[PDB]
Amino acid sequence: LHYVPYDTPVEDVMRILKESGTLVIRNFLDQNTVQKVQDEVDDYVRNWNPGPKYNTKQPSNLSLMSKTYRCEVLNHPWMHAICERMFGPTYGDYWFNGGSILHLEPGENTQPIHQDHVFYQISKWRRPTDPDLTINFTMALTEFTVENGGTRVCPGSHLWENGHASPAEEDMVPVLMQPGDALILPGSMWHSAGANRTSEYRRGFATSFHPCHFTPIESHHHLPREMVEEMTPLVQKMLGFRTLNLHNNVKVWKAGEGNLEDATGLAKLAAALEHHHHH
Amino acid sequence: PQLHYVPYDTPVEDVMRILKESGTLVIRNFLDQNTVQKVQDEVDDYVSNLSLMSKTYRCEVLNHPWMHAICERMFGPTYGDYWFNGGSILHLEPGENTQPIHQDHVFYQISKWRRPTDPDLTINFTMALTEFTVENGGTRVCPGSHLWENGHASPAEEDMVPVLMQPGDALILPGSMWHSAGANRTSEYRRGFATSFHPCHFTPIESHHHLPREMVEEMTPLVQKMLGFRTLNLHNNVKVWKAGEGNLEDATGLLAAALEHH
Ligand SMILES: [Fe+2]
Ligand SMILES: [Fe+2]
């Protein structure tokens, strides 16, 4: 397991991902940003917390509940640098798969050790040298420690052949992370969260991306149009509002024979040209 | 293996047996003449994107019991849910030359990983609007070529078997079946149109999120799932295409037909 600074060259990170199958990018995000995501999620769910004396929505997509998530986190250059080099040559485009809140409650037992691509039926056609089917970025809000259940990884196990037994608990390496660090988790890396034996939640959240030709865990078609229009064009494509280009330049997710973003009406020249009557 | 012409009332397991053995077949009178006429008229008034252009396509054709019976047995065991992939008008003008012989699943990067004994990546239903004759460019198939290993060379032009269809007949084209349109050496256009379906875990060629809400509410729940408006269930009870943790159709506010007090 490698812990690398934010300014590590991209080729070195992909090199380590190839060799060991995982790594941690310290200071992946500033503590400011990860805390803002948690704050915006709290403001969305609005769970009732009783005062000391007598005197709400269910959680949805992180891109819906958190403006910071859909405007800053999903534009993270480290996410797209790794995703472009991981899926690009084989699949062309990639897009957002799913993003979860990873809050470990005090007293929760150890998580089963698993690969994230296990629910892909086609993980049985893939060989360990092929590109991964998905990649997770797990960002710490609280500290990730041994006691509070920080994620454990088994380096090298991404090259294990298909059907290889799950790794042994003794050979699971805990990931120790400060707020803002991120654990890089390809879909083939064997991992699991540990037991939280402390009196406080282990907090954090994740993004994940996978090839454009695979159906994402989450749809974002229920999001209001005002949120979709404040997204960058890159994030609009990530969240399923734009046509995708395969490796062979065949298009999927099209609106008829044209692009989806054209049929839905999803400003550029007006901002650039001062003489545009909409500037 | 050979090309088979079977009637509408053929039992399903025979159709699947023929599909496994020969990789293709024709179901006669797949549509009646009314549907053949109605879809032609609706497209003309609008003039792919067939669900948007033809009310008969999205309300009746996409509910076709043969499509769902075949798709259930082809994709159900391995992937669970399936949904709409793409669909286009197949219009052949006089003088058009022969189409390159191809497999439809060729554009899936994961066709390289698949074995011929695995389930198909996609299936096409090519329905004739005009007659399909050998001289007007009727589709040609190569029965048994779906079982060739990947990277196998294309069939020779002489190994291709033309398909003959009256208006309303349908050719069933798994993604592994080598096929091509012929040259239209007649004086009248050869017309058809297609539906296609593929596993729920694969991204469709065509999105339908640009369709109007009132249009989507005309659809059946089944067709709503076909066209990307409902959460999909995998073979292993895992869900994809979900809204947060709930179903997409609940989050959009998409029983009511069964109970009159609803
Ligand atoms: Fe996981
Ligand atoms: Fe074709």
Automatic annotation (TrEMBL), chain B:
Care to name a GO molecular-function term for this sequence?
dioxygenase activity
- The answer to whether keyword Metal-binding applies is yes
Family per record? Belongs to the PhyH family.
Keyword annotations for this protein?
Dioxygenase, Iron, Metal-binding, Oxidoreductase
Protein name (Swiss-Prot/TrEMBL): 2-oxoglutarate/Fe(II)-dependent dioxygenase SptF
Sites where the protein binds 2-oxoglutarate: 99, 139, 190
One Pfam annotation, family name? PhyH
Q: Which residues form a coiled coil?
A: none
Superkingdom classification of source: Eukaryota
**InterPro entries, per this entry?**
Phytyl_CoA_dOase-like
Residues that coordinate or bind Fe(2+) 1: 102, 104, 179
Its needed co-factors are: Fe cation
Q: Does the keyword Iron apply?
A: yes
**What's the source species for this entry?**
Aspergillus sp
Residues bound to Fe(2+) 2? 104, 179
Recall the taxonomic lineage recorded for the source organism. Answer: Eukaryota, Fungi, Dikarya, Ascomycota, Pezizomycotina
